[PDB]
Amino acid sequence: RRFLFVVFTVLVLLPLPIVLHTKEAECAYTLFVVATFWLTEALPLSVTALLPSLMLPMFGIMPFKDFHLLLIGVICLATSIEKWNLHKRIALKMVMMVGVNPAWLTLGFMSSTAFLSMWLSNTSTAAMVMPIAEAVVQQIINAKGHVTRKLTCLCIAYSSTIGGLTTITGTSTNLIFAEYFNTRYPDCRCLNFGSWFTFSFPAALIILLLSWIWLQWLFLGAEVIKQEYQKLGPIRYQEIVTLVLFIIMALLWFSRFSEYPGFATDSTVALLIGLLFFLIPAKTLTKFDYSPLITWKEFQSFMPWDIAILVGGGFALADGCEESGLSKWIGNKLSPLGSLPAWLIILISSLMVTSLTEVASNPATITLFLPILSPLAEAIHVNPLYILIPSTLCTSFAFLLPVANPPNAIVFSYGHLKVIDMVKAGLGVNIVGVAVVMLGICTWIVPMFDLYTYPSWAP
Amino acid sequence: RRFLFVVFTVLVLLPLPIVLHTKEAECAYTLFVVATFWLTEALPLSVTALLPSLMLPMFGIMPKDFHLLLIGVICLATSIEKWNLHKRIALKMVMMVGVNPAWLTLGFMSSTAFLSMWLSNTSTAAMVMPIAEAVVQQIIKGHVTRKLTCLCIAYSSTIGGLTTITGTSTNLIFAEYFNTRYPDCRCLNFGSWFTFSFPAALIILLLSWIWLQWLFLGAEVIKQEYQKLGPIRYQEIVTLVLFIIMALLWFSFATDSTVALLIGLLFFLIPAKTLTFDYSPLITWKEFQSFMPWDIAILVGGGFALADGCEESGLSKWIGNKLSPLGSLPAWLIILISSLMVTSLTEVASNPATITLFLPILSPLAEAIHVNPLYILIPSTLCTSFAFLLPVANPPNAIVFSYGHLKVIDMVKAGLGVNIVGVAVVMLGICTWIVPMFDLYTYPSWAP
Ligand SMILES: CC(C)CCC[C@@H](C)[C@H]1CC[C@H]2[C@@H]3CC=C4C[C@@H](O)CC[C@]4(C)[C@H]3CC[C@]12C
Ligand SMILES: CC(C)CCC[C@@H](C)[C@H]1CC[C@H]2[C@@H]3CC=C4C[C@@H](O)CC[C@]4(C)[C@H]3CC[C@]12C
Ligand code: NA
Ligand code: NA
Ligand code: NA
Ligand code: NA
């Protein structure tokens, strides 16, 4: 029907009243309705986040930091990159340098959006490169033509998903993990921009280079590209300063200094370079007056404000389940769960989140699964990073059917790509992604964070 | 000049280095920069708020019911503005009191005074002004009616911007400053603000109507503007009945945030009659995200960071032992000389900037001289809104200035009397009816 999720919303609040007895059932009812509206997306993912703060007081259950500074500093750069169309110039420049094209054009279209989705969002990059890739494939073919379109679509979407890793500020499921982690463990200083990039870039490079070979074997065995570049025009003043500030912020992030009062952090670099976008004149004379590179309404458009509401709603639901009396019941109900090998819990939880993320949303899976796996990690006396590092990477591995993330729903709205093509292509990419994450969590991420010893910022 | 406030930004960070000595004159440098950029508006009022988060660590100086009520009122106001119910309310309040020259100024005043309790002053002043221009043009001594109508719209949108904590940003800043710093106070909410602020604003509105009517000037032309926006549709009858339900539930787990979230979250759920194979709600999330004030929290966080930074850097001790005879004054004289200062500075500055600068000045002074904090902080937040002179203070009277009429001396002569009667009514109120409502003559228990 049409009015589906008004009657699905109002017709699950009616049978679910197990509420007509003790308090832990009243908290189970809140947990059920919030999880059901998060999984099915009947409400827009932050109206649901405000529902525990409405429903827990009526039953009787009662209750800025550096990551926000870094998020402000990266959104300031991303708004200027997307606004002045620098992101189209540095996508058509990676193509035409790699594009020898027996099969290197697929690698160029993968590497462009993989680099671009480290900074922008996956949805915006997948919506930007797909017209360019469609025009390039059309004007190369008009000079086997059906498999190139679906290969190009899948190589855009999957590599925009893969490039969405390697940065904490690259996807929303990374922002949610970082905001959960620095709130639950505020005595921990080992997770920042560079330490995330250092362990996540060797994984994503291997996943990209293996997915290229997999898709190129699965589907298949000059002036046409140097004409969409000249339709961009010449280079403007507003995107040379954005490029210079990009290069300066990038090589100031990864290069950490010597002095030590309090300001050698990443949020200092983020604010100190990203607040120059409001100040530097664009040479866009308002007419007596000038205009900057970035105004405040555009920043407010680009800034994710609902992520903090989502983290606060998840934390409120977790404390409601703690102080209501429910977590004791399911904690004494699941006592043989802590007699497992610690790597088997990694395996079953990673397969669980990467199976659930194919039909659910990427923030909705990780917001439900982080307060399940954190006290389990503290209880069985393993490192709480050892459990939570592979689960946030396996939640991003949404490569099957186009209901999981909007990156492969954008490339699906075009005429090509049957659903069985997406399923058969994304199954091998999911397999190699889980295999590379399992290799990494036992080979190179172990000495980087000392995962085999219980930490000191944990209870 | 054109690039004047880039070289005002970069050439005040250069002479201000008194920083080349002790720690106390390093927090008296980030104070001057932030205060100057707030008073001048060289940076957009929240880029400046993030500056103590950048400048205080580099010197060596290291450190929710109102949010839910704000979410509820913002998602009500989004649906009121989106489906054009405010035009129906404004054109219905006029034409009841609408056949005389005066009683038509009062209708245009009462419409935007009622409408700016819920919407913003800028949005109501930019909506009633074309309607009022069309009515004054098609009804028509012809030149003085235009400037009288412009000034009555711009003043009554400001006067109506009181009576609600969620009615103007300088009220939101005070409420967010006061639910912090005194978290054991449970006497300040929506209805207790309305109960003390409505009798003041009604008297100010009526006396301003009489003042402007004496100062300036001693049927089928309004109805065709009401029949121009058609009959009433489903999406605004639903918004009207939810407005009436929320309004008569506010004035009677039973909190104001419960009323704001139980009725306010129904706007995202209720099906509007715009079928997308699908349907669309009354409001979506992008519209709410555009309407929601996100920079007010950044502003109050930057104010709290700058206020706490003056504590460990021993500057507050210096300017506290420097101003020791300040605490030998009568307590009402502090009200008088602070309310006159906040109503004089706000004519040339911004309304959030003045109150963000002056709340951490007046709130420790109240605890120092052993009076009630609300006694000092209520007339200062009421008098900061009294921006009725020249059109650089608030955008409500800069909207009505962009039209052809209304030179500056008219605004000055008209706003001087409105400022005088506003200060007089607030001084009468804080000594007559706000005293037993909050027990202002005794030192509280939420105060140290
Ligand atoms: C979804 C959130 C908000 C609420 C529910 C949290 C549940 C799933 C969590 C919170 C407390 C957890 C328990 C905490 C401690 C132990 C003891 C350990 O030897 C085995 C696992 C076990 C038994 C955990 C199982 C999972 C658990 C019950
Ligand atoms: C963020 C900036 C603006 C904060 C500035 C705070 C200043 C204005 C405050 C903080 C400490 C205050 C002092 C604290 C105590 C006393 C003693 C009293 O007998 C007279 C007032 C006096 C002397 C106050 C004057 C105002 C004061 C100096
Ligand atoms: Na991205
Ligand atoms: Na998904
Ligand atoms: Na208002
Ligand atoms: Na002002």
| A186 at B interface, C-beta within 8 A | no
| B265 at A interface, C-beta within 8 A | yes
Helix (H) or strand (E) holding B271: strand B271-272
Give A97 Cα–ligand 3 centroid separation in angstroms: 23
Residue B399, classified by CB atoms within 10 Å of its CB into exposed (0-12), middle (13-18) or buried (19+), is buried
Report yes or no: B19 and A223 within 8 Å, Cβ to Cβ.
no
**B261:A295 CB<8 A:** no
Tokens of B68: 């839910």
In angstroms, the CA A318 to CA B329 distance is 52
Owner of token pair 């027996």: A102
Report yes or no: A369 and A49 within 8 Å, Cβ to Cβ.
no
- Residues paired with residue B280 on neighbouring β-strands, in sequence order: B272
| B270 at A interface, C-beta within 8 A | yes
Owner of token pair 């832990």: A24
Indicate the residue of A47, A72, A271 with minimum beta-carbon distance to B265.
Answer: A47
In angstroms, the CA A96 to CA A107 distance is 11
**A290:B2 CB<8 A:** yes
Packing angle of the helix pair B121-139, B105-115 (nearest 10 deg): 160
CA dihedral (B133, B136, B139, B140) in degrees, to 10, reads: -110
Indicate the residue of A51, A54, A279 with minimum beta-carbon distance to B9.
Answer: A279
Which mutation among A317, A330, A349, A391 tests ligand 1's pocket best, with the greatest number of atoms within 8 A of CB? A330
One-letter amino acid at A256 equals: R
One-letter amino acid at B427 equals: M
In angstroms, the CA B95 to CA A100 distance is 74
In angstroms, the CA A130 to CA A373 distance is 37
Distance from CA of A66 to the nearest CA of B (A): 9
Question: Nearest to residue A294, comparing CAs of A367, A238, A365?
Answer: A238
Report yes or no: B301 and B49 within 8 Å, Cβ to Cβ.
yes
Which mutation among A32, A334, A335 tests ligand 1's pocket best, with the greatest number of atoms within 8 A of CB? A334
Q: What are phi and psi of A117, to 5 degrees?
A: -85, 0
CB pairs under 8 A between A and B: 100
In angstroms, the CA B394 to CA A159 distance is 49
Owner of token pair 């059906």: A146
Residue B260, classified by CB atoms within 10 Å of its CB into exposed (0-12), middle (13-18) or buried (19+), is buried
Indicate the residue of A272, A290, A301 with minimum beta-carbon distance to B54.
Answer: A272
Ligand 2 atom with the shortest distance to the CA of B360: 4
Residue B320 Cβ < 6 Å to ligand 2:
yes
DSSP code per residue over B237-269: HHHHHHHHHHHHHHT---SHHHHHHHTGGGTTT
Give B373 Cα–ligand 2 centroid separation in angstroms: 14
**Which ligand is the nearest neighbour of the Cα of A167?**
3
One-letter amino acid at A73 equals: G
Which segments of B251-372 does DSSP mark as H helices, in order? 256-262, 285-291, 295-312, 316-321, 331-345, 351-368
| A3 at B interface, C-beta within 8 A | yes
In angstroms, the CA B240 to CA A289 distance is 43
In angstroms, the CA B370 to CA B329 distance is 12
Candidates B50, B51, B259, partner chain A, best to mutate (most A CBs within 10 A): B50
One-letter amino acid at A113 equals: T
Report yes or no: A323 and A26 within 8 Å, Cβ to Cβ.
no
Tokens of B262: 């139980």
One-letter amino acid at B364 equals: P
Report yes or no: B151 and B411 within 8 Å, Cβ to Cβ.
yes
Residue B426 Cβ < 6 Å to ligand 2:
no
Distance from CA of B62 to the nearest CA of A (A): 8
Question: Nearest to residue A320, comparing CAs of A35, A17, A69?
Answer: A35
Tokens of A229: 């570049």
**B285:A46 CB<8 A:** yes
Tokens of A5: 């999720």
Report yes or no: B83 and B239 within 8 Å, Cβ to Cβ.
yes
Report yes or no: A133 and A109 within 8 Å, Cβ to Cβ.
yes
Q: Quick one: resolution in A? A: 2.9
For A143-176, letters b (16+ CB in 10 Å) and e give eeeeebbbbbbbbbbbbbbbbbbbbbbbbbbbbb
In angstroms, the CA B23 to CA B71 distance is 41
Indicate the residue of A44, A64, A288 with minimum beta-carbon distance to B2.
Answer: A288
Report yes or no: A417 and A154 within 8 Å, Cβ to Cβ.
yes
Give A331 Cα–ligand 1 centroid separation in angstroms: 5
| B59 at A interface, C-beta within 8 A | yes
In angstroms, the CA B413 to CA B420 distance is 11
In angstroms, the CA B76 to CA B264 distance is 6
Q: Which residues sit with their C-beta closer than 6 Å to ligand 1?
A: A 317-318, 321, 327, 330-331, 334, 337-338, 371-372, 375-376, 379-380
| A47 at B interface, C-beta within 8 A | yes
In angstroms, the CA B359 to CA B361 distance is 5
Q: What is the DSSP letter of B329?
A: S
Distance from CA of A10 to the nearest CA of B (A): 10
Q: Which residues contact B421 (CB under 8 A, 6 or more apart)?
A: B204, B207, B208, B211
Question: Nearest to residue B405, comparing CAs of B107, B215, B37, B147?
Answer: B147
How many residues are listed for chain A in this entry? 459
- 3-state SS of chain A is CCCHHHHHHHCCCCCCCCCCCCHHHHHHHHHHHHHHHHHHCCCCCCCCCCCHHHHHHHHCCCCCCHHHHHHHHHHHHHHHHHHCCHHHHCCCCCCCCCCCCCCHHHHHHHHHHHHHCCCCCHHHHHHHHHHHHHHHHHHHHCCCHHHHHHHHHHHHHHHHHHHCCCCCCCCHHHHHHHHHHHHHCCCCCCCCHHHHHHHHHHHHHHHHHHHHHHHHHHHCCCCCCCCCCCCCCCCCHHHHHHHHHHHHHHHHHCCCCCCCCCCCCHHHHHHHHHCCCCCCECCCCECCECCECCCHHHHHHHCCCHHHHHHHHHHHHHHHHHHHCHHHHHHHHCHHHHCCCHHHHHHHHHHHHHHHCCCCCHHHHHHHHHHHHHHHHHHCCCCHHHHHHHHHHHCCCCCCCCCCCHHHHHCCCCCCCCHHHHHHHHHHHHHHHHHHHHHHHHHCCHHHHCCCCCCCCCC
Q: How many CB atoms lie within 10 A of CB B213?
A: 17
In angstroms, the CA B400 to CA B151 distance is 7
Distances (CA, A) of A208 to A15, A157, A216, B271, B351: 47, 12, 12, 43, 53
